[PDB]
Short mmCIF file of C-alpha atoms and ligand atoms in Angstrom, two decimals:
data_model
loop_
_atom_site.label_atom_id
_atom_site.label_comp_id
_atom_site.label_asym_id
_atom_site.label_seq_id
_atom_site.Cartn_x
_atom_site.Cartn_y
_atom_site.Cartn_z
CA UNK A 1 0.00 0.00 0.00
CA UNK A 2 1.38 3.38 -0.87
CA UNK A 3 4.85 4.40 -2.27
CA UNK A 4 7.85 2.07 -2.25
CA UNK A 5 11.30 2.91 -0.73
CA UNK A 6 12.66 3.09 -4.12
CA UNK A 7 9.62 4.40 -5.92
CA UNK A 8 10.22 7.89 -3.21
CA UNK A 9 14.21 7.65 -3.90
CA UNK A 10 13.79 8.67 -7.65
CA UNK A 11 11.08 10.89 -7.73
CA UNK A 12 12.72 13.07 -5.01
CA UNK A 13 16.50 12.65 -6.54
CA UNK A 14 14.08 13.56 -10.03
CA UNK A 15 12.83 16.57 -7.88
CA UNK A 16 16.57 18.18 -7.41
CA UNK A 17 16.83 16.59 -3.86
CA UNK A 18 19.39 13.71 -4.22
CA UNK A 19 22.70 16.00 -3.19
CA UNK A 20 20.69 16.30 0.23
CA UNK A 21 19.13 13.45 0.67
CA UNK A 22 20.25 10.85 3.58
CA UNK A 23 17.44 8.34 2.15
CA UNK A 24 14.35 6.74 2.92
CA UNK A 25 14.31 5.26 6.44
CA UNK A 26 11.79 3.58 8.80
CA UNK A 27 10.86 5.58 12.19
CA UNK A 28 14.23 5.26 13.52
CA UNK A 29 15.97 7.68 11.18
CA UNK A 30 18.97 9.39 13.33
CA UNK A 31 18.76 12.68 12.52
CA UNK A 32 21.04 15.37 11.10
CA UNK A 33 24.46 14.51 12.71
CA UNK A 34 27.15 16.21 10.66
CA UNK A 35 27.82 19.07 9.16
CA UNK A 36 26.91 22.40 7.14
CA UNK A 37 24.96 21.29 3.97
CA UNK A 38 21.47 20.96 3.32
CA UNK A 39 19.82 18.13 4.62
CA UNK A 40 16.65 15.68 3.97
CA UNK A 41 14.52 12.78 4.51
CA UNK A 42 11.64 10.80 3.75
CA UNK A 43 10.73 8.47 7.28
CA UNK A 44 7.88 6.30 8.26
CA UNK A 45 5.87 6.27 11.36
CA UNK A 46 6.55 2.38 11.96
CA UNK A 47 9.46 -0.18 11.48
CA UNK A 48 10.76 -1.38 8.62
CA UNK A 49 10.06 -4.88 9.89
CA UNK A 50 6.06 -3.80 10.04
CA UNK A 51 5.94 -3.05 5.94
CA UNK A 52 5.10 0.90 6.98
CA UNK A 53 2.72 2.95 7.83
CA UNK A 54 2.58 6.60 6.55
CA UNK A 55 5.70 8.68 5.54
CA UNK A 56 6.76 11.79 6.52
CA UNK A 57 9.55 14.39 5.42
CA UNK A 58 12.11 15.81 7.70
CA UNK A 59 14.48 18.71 6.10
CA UNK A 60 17.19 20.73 8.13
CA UNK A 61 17.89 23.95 7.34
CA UNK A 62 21.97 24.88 8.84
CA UNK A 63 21.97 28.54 7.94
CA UNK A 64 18.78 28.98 10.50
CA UNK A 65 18.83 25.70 12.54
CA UNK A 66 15.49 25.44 11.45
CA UNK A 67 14.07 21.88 11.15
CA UNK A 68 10.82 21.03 9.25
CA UNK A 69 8.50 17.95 9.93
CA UNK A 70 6.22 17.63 6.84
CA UNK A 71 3.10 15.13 8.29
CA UNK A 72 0.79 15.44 4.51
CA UNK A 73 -1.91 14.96 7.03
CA UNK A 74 -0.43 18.03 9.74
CA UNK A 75 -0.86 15.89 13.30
CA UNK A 76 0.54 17.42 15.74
CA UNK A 77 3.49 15.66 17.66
CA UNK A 78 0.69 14.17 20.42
CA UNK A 79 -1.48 13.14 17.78
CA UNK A 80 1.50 11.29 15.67
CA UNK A 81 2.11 9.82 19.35
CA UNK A 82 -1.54 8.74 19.71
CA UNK A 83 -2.58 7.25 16.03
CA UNK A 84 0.92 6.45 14.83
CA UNK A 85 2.99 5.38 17.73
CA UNK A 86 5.68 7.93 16.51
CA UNK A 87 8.12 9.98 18.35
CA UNK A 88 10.81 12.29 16.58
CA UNK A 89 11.91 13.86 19.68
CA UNK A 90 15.26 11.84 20.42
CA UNK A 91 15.95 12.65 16.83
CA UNK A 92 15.68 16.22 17.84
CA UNK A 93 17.62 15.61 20.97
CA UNK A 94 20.48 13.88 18.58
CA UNK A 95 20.84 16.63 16.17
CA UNK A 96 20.52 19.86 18.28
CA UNK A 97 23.16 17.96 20.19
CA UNK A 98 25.03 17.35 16.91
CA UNK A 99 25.08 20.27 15.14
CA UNK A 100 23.90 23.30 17.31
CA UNK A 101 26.60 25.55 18.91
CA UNK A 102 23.69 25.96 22.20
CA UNK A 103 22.52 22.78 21.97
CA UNK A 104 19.01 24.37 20.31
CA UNK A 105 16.70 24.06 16.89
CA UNK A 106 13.91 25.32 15.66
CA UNK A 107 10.83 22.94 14.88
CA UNK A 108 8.69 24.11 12.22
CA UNK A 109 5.51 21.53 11.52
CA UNK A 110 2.63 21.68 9.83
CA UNK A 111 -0.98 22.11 11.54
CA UNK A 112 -3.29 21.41 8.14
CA UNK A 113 -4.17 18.15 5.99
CA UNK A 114 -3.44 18.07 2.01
CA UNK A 115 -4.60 14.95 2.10
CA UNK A 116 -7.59 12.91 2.30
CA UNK A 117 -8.39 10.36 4.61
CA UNK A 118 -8.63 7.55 2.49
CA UNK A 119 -5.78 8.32 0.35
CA UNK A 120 -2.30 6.03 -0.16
CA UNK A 121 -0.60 9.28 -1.51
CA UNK A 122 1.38 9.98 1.61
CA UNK A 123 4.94 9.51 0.26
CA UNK A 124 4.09 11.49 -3.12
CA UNK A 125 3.12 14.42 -0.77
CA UNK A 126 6.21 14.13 1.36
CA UNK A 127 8.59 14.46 -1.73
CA UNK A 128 6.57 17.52 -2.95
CA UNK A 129 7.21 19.48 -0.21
CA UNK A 130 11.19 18.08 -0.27
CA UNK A 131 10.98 19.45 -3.29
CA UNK A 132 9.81 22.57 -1.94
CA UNK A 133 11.93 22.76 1.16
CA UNK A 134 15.18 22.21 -0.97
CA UNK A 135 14.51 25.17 -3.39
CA UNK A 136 13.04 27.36 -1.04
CA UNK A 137 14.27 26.46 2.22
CA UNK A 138 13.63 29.35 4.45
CA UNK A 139 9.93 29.11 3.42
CA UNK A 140 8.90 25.70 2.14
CA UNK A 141 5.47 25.04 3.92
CA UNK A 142 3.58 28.01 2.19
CA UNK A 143 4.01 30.57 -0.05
CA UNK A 144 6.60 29.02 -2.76
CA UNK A 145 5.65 28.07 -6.31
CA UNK A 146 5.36 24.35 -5.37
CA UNK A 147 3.33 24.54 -2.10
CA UNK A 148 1.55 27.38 -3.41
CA UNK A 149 -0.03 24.34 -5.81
CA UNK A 150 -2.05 23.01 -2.89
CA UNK A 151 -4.78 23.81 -0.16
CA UNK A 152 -4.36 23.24 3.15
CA UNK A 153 -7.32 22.05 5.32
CA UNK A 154 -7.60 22.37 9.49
CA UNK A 155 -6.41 19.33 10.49
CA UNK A 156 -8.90 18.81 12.82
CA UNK A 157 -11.47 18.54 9.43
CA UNK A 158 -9.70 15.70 8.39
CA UNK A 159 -12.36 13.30 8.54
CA UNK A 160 -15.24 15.82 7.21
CA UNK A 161 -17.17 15.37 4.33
CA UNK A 162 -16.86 19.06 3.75
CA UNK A 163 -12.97 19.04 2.49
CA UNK A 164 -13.15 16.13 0.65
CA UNK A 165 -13.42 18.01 -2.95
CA UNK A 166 -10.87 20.29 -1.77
CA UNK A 167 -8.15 17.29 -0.58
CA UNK A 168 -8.99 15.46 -4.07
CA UNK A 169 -8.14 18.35 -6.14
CA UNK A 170 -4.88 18.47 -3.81
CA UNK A 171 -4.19 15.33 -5.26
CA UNK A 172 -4.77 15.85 -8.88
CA UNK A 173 -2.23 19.15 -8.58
CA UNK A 174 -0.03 16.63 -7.01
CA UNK A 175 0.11 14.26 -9.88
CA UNK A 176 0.05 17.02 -12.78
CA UNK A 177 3.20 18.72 -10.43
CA UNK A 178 5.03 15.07 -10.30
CA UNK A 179 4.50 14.67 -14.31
CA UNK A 180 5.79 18.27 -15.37
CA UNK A 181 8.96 17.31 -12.54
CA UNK A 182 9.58 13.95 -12.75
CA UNK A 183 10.69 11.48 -15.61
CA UNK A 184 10.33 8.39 -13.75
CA UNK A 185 6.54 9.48 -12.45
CA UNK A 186 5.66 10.09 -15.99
CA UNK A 187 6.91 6.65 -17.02
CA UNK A 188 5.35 4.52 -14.73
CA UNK A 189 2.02 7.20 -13.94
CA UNK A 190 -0.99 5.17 -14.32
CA UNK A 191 0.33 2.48 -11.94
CA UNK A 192 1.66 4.81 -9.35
CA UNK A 193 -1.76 6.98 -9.64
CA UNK A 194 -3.49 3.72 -9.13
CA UNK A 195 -1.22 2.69 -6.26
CA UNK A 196 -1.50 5.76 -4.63
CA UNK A 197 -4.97 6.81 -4.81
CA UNK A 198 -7.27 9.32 -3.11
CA UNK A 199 -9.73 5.98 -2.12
CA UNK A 200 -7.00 3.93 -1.88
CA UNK A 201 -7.08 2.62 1.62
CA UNK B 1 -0.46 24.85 4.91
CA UNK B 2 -0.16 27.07 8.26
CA UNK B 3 2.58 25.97 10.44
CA UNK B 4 3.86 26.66 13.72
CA UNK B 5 7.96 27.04 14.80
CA UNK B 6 8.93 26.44 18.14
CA UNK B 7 12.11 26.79 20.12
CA UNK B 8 13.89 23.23 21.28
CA UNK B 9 16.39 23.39 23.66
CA UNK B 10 18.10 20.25 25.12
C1 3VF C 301 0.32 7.22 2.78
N1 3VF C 301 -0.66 7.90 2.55
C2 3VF C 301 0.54 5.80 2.92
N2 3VF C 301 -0.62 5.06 2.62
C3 3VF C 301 -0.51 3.72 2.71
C4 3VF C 301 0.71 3.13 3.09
C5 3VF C 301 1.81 3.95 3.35
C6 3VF C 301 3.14 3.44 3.80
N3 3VF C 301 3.73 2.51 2.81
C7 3VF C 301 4.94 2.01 3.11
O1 3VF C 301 5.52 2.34 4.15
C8 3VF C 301 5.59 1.09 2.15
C9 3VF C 301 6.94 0.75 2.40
C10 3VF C 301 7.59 -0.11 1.54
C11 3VF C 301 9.07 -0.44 1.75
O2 3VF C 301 9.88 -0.08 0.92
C12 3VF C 301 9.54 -1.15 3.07
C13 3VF C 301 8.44 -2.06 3.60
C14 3VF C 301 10.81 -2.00 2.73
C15 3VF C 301 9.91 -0.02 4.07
C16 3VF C 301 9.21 0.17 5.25
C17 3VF C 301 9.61 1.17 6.11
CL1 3VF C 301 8.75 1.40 7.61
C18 3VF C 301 10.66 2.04 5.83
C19 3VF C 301 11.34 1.82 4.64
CL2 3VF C 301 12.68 2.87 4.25
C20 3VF C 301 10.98 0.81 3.75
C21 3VF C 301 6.93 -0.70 0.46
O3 3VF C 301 7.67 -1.55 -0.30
C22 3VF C 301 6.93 -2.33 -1.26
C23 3VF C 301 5.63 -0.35 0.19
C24 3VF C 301 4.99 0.56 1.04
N4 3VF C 301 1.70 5.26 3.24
#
């Protein structure tokens, strides 16, 4: 269900991101543990060994120790706690600890859904706004060209009926962004559409 | 999407 390990590897190194990118991990991804370039990461809520959950993106910013949590879906951290069984804070801990002169970051997460409910799109979304964060990355949750593309919703109206057109046309800008950006989306786009659909799940 | 930065010190 949802996007491969690989499949999320080439669309974001497609998207620009591969100089940056530390990979695809499950939820035990380290963190950002060495020094001064640009840094991303596609990670799971759950264990490799489980066959995943949902995917998030992680980028750090050096020049403002800023690091983003993309969750397509915009739970807050007690929320990914509750449904997910995810923590990111030792992550934190690790690269503050790493890489910050006063042993302090800046968090910067989302609070709004892109996504629907249903849908298997999850990864698709997370290398969207990589793609986002590494062109623009002292803005990439709103107002750049690529996030500009989509709608965000209250989180909290996730499971309305009311923002279902809205999170469905989220999707389609999401697709017709991946084919104008990505060769290896446009090859193989029917069957990652299908795989990744609004209804999916 | 809105977002929200916070300060993490450790
Ligand atoms: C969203 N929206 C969404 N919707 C449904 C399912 C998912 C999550 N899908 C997966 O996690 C997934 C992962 C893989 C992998 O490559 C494995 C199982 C090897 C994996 C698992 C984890 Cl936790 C982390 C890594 Cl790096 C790799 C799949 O391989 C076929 C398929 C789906 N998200």
């Amino acid at each position: 269900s949802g996007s491969s390990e690989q499949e999320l590897a080439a669309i974001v190194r497609d998207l620009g991101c591969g100089p940056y990118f530390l990979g695809t991990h499950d939820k035990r991804f380290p963190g950002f543990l060495a020094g001064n370039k640009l840094a991303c990461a596609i990670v799971n809520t759950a264990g490799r060994e489980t066959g995943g959950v949902h995917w998030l993106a992680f980028g750090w910013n050096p020049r403002s120790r800023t690091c983003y949590m993309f969750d397509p879906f915009g739970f807050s951290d007690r929320r990914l706690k509750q449904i997910y069984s995810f923590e990111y804070e030792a992550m934190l801990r690790r690269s503050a600890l790493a890489l910050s002169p006063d042993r302090c970051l800046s968090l910067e997460q989302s609070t709004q859904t892109v996504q629907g409910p249903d849908s298997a799109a999850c990864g698709l979304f997370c290398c969207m706004f990589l793609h986002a964060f590494v062109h623009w990355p002292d803005r990439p949750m709103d107002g750049n060209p690529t996030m500009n593309l989509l709608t965000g919703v209250p989180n909290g109206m996730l499971q309305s009926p009311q923002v279902l057109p809205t999170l469905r046309r989220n999707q389609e800008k999401l697709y017709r962004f991946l084919a104008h950006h990505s060769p290896y989306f446009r090859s193989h786009r029917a069957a990652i559409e299908h795989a990744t659909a609004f209804d999916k799940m | 999407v809105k977002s929200l930065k916070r300060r993490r010190c450790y």
